[PDB]
Amino acid sequence: ARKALIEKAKRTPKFKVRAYTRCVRCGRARSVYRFFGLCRICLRELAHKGQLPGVRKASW
Amino acid sequence: GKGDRRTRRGKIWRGTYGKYRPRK
């Protein structure tokens, strides 16, 4: 049950409380971001390709 | 100690403010 969820998550009619996030690419509910809209897994992936604007292998 | 709510430290550690650590 991860298909019906991604959709169930999209719908929102019920109490804004239950309005929860979820990765845009992969149907993942954990460790998402209020930015990117990606999951740690996904993010790092795209990140390595370059499809993530201005994002760079951090260095300090 | 950092564990007593009714103390300056305690309150601080807890990251809170109150009668023992008011906002000025």
Partner: protein, 98 residues
């Protein structure tokens, strides 16, 4: 009087696109305040390399948001033609005020 902002990412471009708006802002009349490089806001975020369980050896990235300011002293109808129509930002963004 008129203020202009310059965000974006690659400070390699933004720098040029901005610098252009001076060598071309002087020719249009009033003097200008050299391209001033204000502080950079940064976006750092860490991630656990593995797709599973390895809280160590993880990996974090950065997202440098370079900003840059410059401003014309007197608003010439001259300058206007340039600026307003010389919209040439590849990946740049500019905000203007007074």
């Amino acid at each position: 009087k008129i203020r202009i902002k310059l965000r974006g990412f690659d400070h390699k471009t933004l720098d040029a696109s901005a610098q252009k708006i001076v060598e071309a802002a002087r020719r249009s009349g009033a003097q200008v305040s050299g391209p001033i490089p204000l502080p950079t806001r940064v976006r750092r975020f860490t991630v656990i390399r593995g797709p599973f369980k390895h809280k160590d050896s993880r990996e974090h990235f950065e997202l440098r948001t370079h900003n840059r300011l410059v401003d014309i002293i007197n608003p010439n109808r001259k300058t206007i033609e340039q600026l307003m129509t010389l919209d040439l930002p590849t990946g740049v963004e500019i905000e203007i005020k007074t």
